[PDB]
Ligand binder design. Sequence first.
Ligand SMILES: [Cl-]
Ligand SMILES: [Cl-]
Ligand code: NA
Ligand code: NA
Length: 325
Amino acid sequence: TLNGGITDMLVELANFEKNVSQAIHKYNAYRKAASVIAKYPHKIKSGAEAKKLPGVGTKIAEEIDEFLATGKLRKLEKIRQDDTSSSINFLTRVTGIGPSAARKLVDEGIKTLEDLRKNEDKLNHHQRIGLKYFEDFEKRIPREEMLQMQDIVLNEVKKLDPEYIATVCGSFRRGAESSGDMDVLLTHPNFTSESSKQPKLLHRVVEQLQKVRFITDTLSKGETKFMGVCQLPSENDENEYPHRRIDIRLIPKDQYYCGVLYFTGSDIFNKNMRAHALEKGFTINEYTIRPLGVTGVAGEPLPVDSEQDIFDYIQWRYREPKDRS
Ligand SMILES: [Cl-]
Ligand SMILES: [Cl-]
Ligand code: NA
Ligand code: NA
């Protein structure tokens, strides 16, 4: 406005004393001083004309002369470039880790750049390889490269035993020109709802992947899920294809095409899909499709041999992946 560059100033002063300090009475005084300047119908040109108004005071007018010369203030940006605030935004920047370890990490006086080795008395990691491939995780992944990651893995799988089936999901199957990672799903006809549990089916696929040296590291094992790091092979070009990021997941044969729909679709889409079923009278899950009716009591599960057997059941014209936004 007229003096309405010095009212933007005086507001922020009042927030920090409300919060991270909590000096009331000095929350109050800052605040009244804002209004008096807002009402005065004349452009101020010196903190020397300010003491005359019954609102502004002693050390307050003083802070205005520094404002009206430079156009910047000591008692301000110092609170702005030092706070835990606008550093929560920084501290994680250079970490690739977890919520409450920061604080104690930071609390050691350890920070972003030239503040990083200065104090390394935590000797943790992530899990022992976060802080190392920190550099390649923050770049996107071109489509063209996704296609030949895909092609290698299906090749190994089938050569072991042609009864396996496997497919890749996420943004890649929707049709992106760039991705953030890889997510794959895996089944076999000797694992079902009513059977013994079999991790050895997933161990084998992993071990042979290491053998041809496509998989390089391990972050997590289990009976159902693996979590690691991979790389494409070179003939002798530049320094590197960057190291990348892959997940793998084992599922019952009879609940397969119910999970694949689920690891694609789209959030918004998957939400609009489960309401139309309510209308026609069905209930749909990450595991099954069941007959409902009358009240809260679903029936048996109905049989499914394909993605499309699902659409039929609820009376919808089919919709290809490219269109599931
Ligand atoms: Cl961690
Ligand atoms: Cl994917
Ligand atoms: Na993080
Ligand atoms: Na995308």
